[PDB]
From a paper:
[name] is an ABC transporter of broad substrate specificity expressed in various tissues and tissue barriers.
We, therefore, refer to the [name]-bound structure as turnover-2 as well. In the structure containing [name] (turnover-2), the substrates could be fit in two orientations related approximately by a 180° rotation. When compared to the previously reported structure of [name]- and 5D3-Fab-bound [name] in an inward-open conformation, [name] appeared slightly shifted (~1 Å) towards the leucine gate and thus towards the external side of the transporter. In the topotecan-bound [name] sample, the dominant class (88% of the ordered particles) belonged to the turnover-1 state, whereas 12% particles belonged to the turnover-2 state. This suggests that turnover-1 is the lowest-energy state of [name] in the presence of topotecan, whereas turnover-2 is the lowest-energy state in the presence of [name]. For these substrates, turnover-2 appears to immediately precede the rate-limiting step of the transport cycle.
Residue numbers in the entry:
A (entry chain A), B (entry chain B): 34 to 48, 58 to 301, 326 to 353, 367 to 654
Amino acid sequence: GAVLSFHNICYRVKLPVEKEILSNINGIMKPGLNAILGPTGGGKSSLLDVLAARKDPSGLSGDVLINGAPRPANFKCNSGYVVQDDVVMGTLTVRENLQFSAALRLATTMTNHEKNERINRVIQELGLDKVADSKVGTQFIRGVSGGERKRTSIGMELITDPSILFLDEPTTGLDSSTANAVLLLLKRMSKQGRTIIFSIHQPRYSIFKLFDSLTLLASGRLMFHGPAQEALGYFESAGYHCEAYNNPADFFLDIINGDKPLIEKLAEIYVNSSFYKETKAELHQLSISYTTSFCHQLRWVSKRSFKNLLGNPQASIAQIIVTVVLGLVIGAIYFGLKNDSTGIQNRAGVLFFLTTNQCFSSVSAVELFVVEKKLFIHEYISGYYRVSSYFLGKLLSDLLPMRMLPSIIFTCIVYFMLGLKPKADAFFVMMFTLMMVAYSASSMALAIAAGQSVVSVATLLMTICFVFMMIFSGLLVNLTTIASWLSWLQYFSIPRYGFTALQHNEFLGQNFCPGLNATGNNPCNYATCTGEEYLVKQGIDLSPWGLWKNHVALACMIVIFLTIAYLKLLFLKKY
Amino acid sequence: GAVLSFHNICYRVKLPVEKEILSNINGIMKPGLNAILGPTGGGKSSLLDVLAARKDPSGLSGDVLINGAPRPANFKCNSGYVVQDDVVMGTLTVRENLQFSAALRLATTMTNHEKNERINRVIQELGLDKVADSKVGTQFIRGVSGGERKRTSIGMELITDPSILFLDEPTTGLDSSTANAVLLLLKRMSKQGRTIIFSIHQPRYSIFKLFDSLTLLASGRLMFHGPAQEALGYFESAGYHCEAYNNPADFFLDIINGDKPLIEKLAEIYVNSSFYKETKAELHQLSISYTTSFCHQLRWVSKRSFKNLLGNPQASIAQIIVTVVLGLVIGAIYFGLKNDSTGIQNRAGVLFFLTTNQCFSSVSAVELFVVEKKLFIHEYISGYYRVSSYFLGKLLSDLLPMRMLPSIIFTCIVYFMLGLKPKADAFFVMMFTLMMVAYSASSMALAIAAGQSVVSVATLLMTICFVFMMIFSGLLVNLTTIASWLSWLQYFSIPRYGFTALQHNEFLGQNFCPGLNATGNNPCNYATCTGEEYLVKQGIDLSPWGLWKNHVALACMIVIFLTIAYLKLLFLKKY
Ligand SMILES: Nc1ncnc2c1ncn2[C@@H]1O[C@H](COP(=O)(O)OP(=O)(O)OP(=O)(O)O)[C@@H](O)[C@H]1O
Ligand SMILES: Nc1ncnc2c1ncn2[C@@H]1O[C@H](COP(=O)(O)OP(=O)(O)OP(=O)(O)O)[C@@H](O)[C@H]1O
Ligand SMILES: CC(C)CCC[C@@H](C)[C@H]1CC[C@H]2[C@@H]3CC=C4C[C@@H](O)CC[C@]4(C)[C@H]3CC[C@]12C
Ligand SMILES: CC(C)CCC[C@@H](C)[C@H]1CC[C@H]2[C@@H]3CC=C4C[C@@H](O)CC[C@]4(C)[C@H]3CC[C@]12C
Ligand SMILES: CC(C)CCC[C@@H](C)[C@H]1CC[C@H]2[C@@H]3CC=C4C[C@@H](O)CC[C@]4(C)[C@H]3CC[C@]12C
Ligand SMILES: CC(C)CCC[C@@H](C)[C@H]1CC[C@H]2[C@@H]3CC=C4C[C@@H](O)CC[C@]4(C)[C@H]3CC[C@]12C
Ligand SMILES: C[C@]12CC[C@H]3c4ccc(OS(=O)(=O)O)cc4CC[C@@H]3[C@@H]1CCC2=O
């Protein structure tokens, strides 16, 4: 089968400040059951990642040679990597997660019936039949414990039918007789050609027999590499005796920890050993395309995020409910506005609140998008889909429906309850304008929080930007008294465009005076008797170009921010 | 030493829907080294909690008898409980955490020098000298690994000099030769009278010798209880043989898992065993005050939260910085307001924004308070302090300084930059009013989010309430057109009181007309020529009672909400 091999592996990590993890490991793997066993945080996951082509190639001083020839281009297609920290999506069922992996990472012509057959096979083999359709962990719903979740994580890669396999701590938290079941499964599979590579913590001596090739790492340096049955012989020759300890693994790990630095002494002793010579001799003897179409990747990512949204209420149902309640409350407060000395303040207040609420709502959904960062990274480097597919899928999942909906709710209730402009064109223009401001706010939210780690800083920055934009809306300050050298910032406010468009189609045919015919017989200034005078004092144009110009400014903002978000994703250091 | 004993322990957990965890355990502990070893999620933490008096006594059908006499009142004073999930505060150093525990849970007359001596002793013994003053984990700052963190958690109770000790999975993630160090320490201590009780996952056969009394739990039922050296004899008699397996613990746990339900068969076999008779025979043979003063508990909790705030920037430094920047920006935008046709809109906008920003800021700090819920619960049931002490400590830590500060910043910048009322009394009234609204918003935040689990729902509810309150502020809707049967809600708005008080001392001596002397020669209505006419149209009283009444309404809201928060804490199911 696959014969991975490496030569002079080294690595460095930037703390301008740099360190070395993994100092100079020289070794060969083989088809069968290979292993990496060493002290925690000594270089176990690091080496596994480096072998899996999952770290930035600005540190692997050295190489990797599959069967001699360099890493084939489909290497990430032909191998599975079981992560160490359970990147399984919490709001789905187990069977749906496995369906997801099977649908994306397998062939196309395979009938769905056979995919389900394989899924049931994995479900039985991993010991998951009871929780097969249960719900994985969530903050609201307590879910299956680590055992079932980790077995889910392992199944997600086991379903891929890989010809190479990688695992990082496959049994951490698995119960003693379920870890044994897992490893007996692995050993049974590792007799058909699959080259298994994994780390492990304190295996049982029964497990220890199953191994073929063993590798000890402690503080980067390679300590031993050879068959597990001769690990004992090596240490026995180098002045140690087995019989005192009964589980070889503990004898090995105690030797490392002292049961003039020792680690270097062990390293320089190994480099003097015959195994090293055999390693060097054979080593010198020896010397992206995705599976399924774009439409399919789009379909399946969109469906998964549909399921996630329906499963998560605090961003989907909570928003709709608070929107309905606010619509009703506002319909009650300002009910039946009067064309009177109060109508101007009332109308400006209503329009400003609708606009600013449409703006500030978008933060919740972008938080739900941000928390997917690590999951997305792991799914990408594992070769699921293209970046563009993930992007458009998330768009059609959340940004399209959950933001198009509240605007319809708000207009359909408020508009006729509050007695705004009574024609139809004004109704639909209000509806469309609210849609536009919602989408633009979402786009800015994405472009700010596309590629960020922590959700609290993203939220803080987003709220700061939105506050700065709404300060320029036009209600809080009369825009014609802002100084000359600061007015230019008025063009950068989404609420400005939205609120301006809303006022322009509302105030246009209005007059707020006791009797319009003979209220001008005493034509005092500072009167605002007609609506248009109020519109002018706020600095707004009157020909339809004012309204449509606001709309096109909003559309341009949408497109620009979406492209910026896509670029921040594409160039992100996806490692 | 202490001889805990129990009889007919049972428990139930409400899923109106109920289950049984821990079915009918009957057993004795003794001074020395006792243990609980059984399959994961089979009843190991549950029993330990029940013995530790840490579950609601609506399920312990049965009893616990220390040396025969019932549980003494200082039982939570004389025992330490090492939790399973690392409730150590992430933003402190290790030595400061241990100082905290030593200062609260030990005597008073002990000189601080000796407390530090004990701390160094524990630091050496637990293997923590290197990270003794490092920083525990944080999102912003990567921190010491679980090994060091778990040793910190264990030290926090080991410093108490307890005459009884409890541990739940003391070694999960500890390195093989550090787990061995921990357990050799425990065994060495368990020869001086301390009655150690702990669970464990897959101990080594070397460790297995150290035990004195063993206890196997699998699906609630008691499987075996007797010395670890005769556990083998029991199973050997009941048709099993040891030699096939080399680590007794794995032989035991494999027997449970099948290496006609078996679990009940084992239970009914045990109840027929001689050990059961000895247990029954001896069992039938056998048959809160805090340490330090209030001032001291207050001092130390306040100091710890001081350290936490300084260590956390996103709620302490970020707020001050954004406040300064907003102060400068607002000072620039409205610079030098004019008593002119725009002054009314400008002034109302500035005052409304200041008020609503003071209101909406309080959410961050209350989030930081909410995330302390589980930590507070664990520290209370462990007998650190009184509830009132924790409450007043958190108040003097966060609510006092971090909310008193921004108001001073805002007034000192904005007030003179924007040319508001130019006397001093108005300056200080604005300052005091902003302080009051800040405190009232914080109080409502606490009373809403005192005793809540998830931070996202608390934030959502809080923002909904704040939005509903500001809708009634007076800028967005003219309060005299709200219907009769909804006006009463105007008294429930903090922004209403704050904004009203701010407008009342500002608009009072003002007139917004071209030339005041002969602008009334054309006395048209809908003019708002003087400020007071604007004040009246908004429905505000003019005698000083308007201003002071707003202040007293705010003070009453503060007191009411603080008492409500304290009651929600006190009656909380602190188990
Ligand atoms: N990205 C990183 N940043 C900072 N330090 C790192 C980074 N990667 C490794 N290190 C450091 O290198 C040392 C070894 O890390 P390593 O990844 O090999 O532990 P590990 O293999 O994952 O052990 P385990 O699998 O049990 O968790 C660690 O002490 C760690 O501090
Ligand atoms: N408060 C509870 N609510 C619901 N179920 C519970 C509760 N306490 C226990 N259980 C149930 O009882 C079973 C056993 O729980 P238990 O506490 O004994 O696991 P455990 O001892 O803590 O195992 P481990 O220590 O490794 O975590 C679990 O399956 C759990 O679902
Ligand atoms: C019902 C209306 C009037 C309440 C106002 C909206 C807020 C307060 C309500 C509306 C719907 C509610 C949510 C409905 C469903 C769930 C799922 C549950 O497992 C946890 C609570 C949670 C997340 C609720 C939290 C509170 C919530 C968001
Ligand atoms: C990176 C982000 C913030 C880029 C900001 C670009 C925005 C502000 C740009 C994109 C298109 C631009 C608009 C293009 C056309 C018009 C119509 C014109 O008669 C007035 C200016 C106006 C309305 C522009 C204002 C600025 C504008 C809206
Ligand atoms: C638009 C303007 C005002 C944005 C203001 C952002 C400033 C005030 C905020 C944004 C993100 C914040 C940073 C977030 C994380 C860290 C890392 C930590 O180890 C030190 C504090 C530090 C560096 C914070 C300091 C305050 C900070 C820089
Ligand atoms: C739990 C929450 C909603 C408590 C609500 C309490 C509020 C509404 C209470 C607390 C203090 C009260 C105020 C105390 C004093 C005055 C001054 C008086 O000349 C008019 C009534 C007025 C203004 C009261 C109105 C009601 C009031 C504001
Ligand atoms: C209340 C409001 C939503 C949120 C408000 C807000 C929220 C945070 C804030 O500052 S912040 O520190 O929380 O970042 C300031 C403001 C000022 C006005 C703004 C709106 C007026 C109408 C509206 O619906």
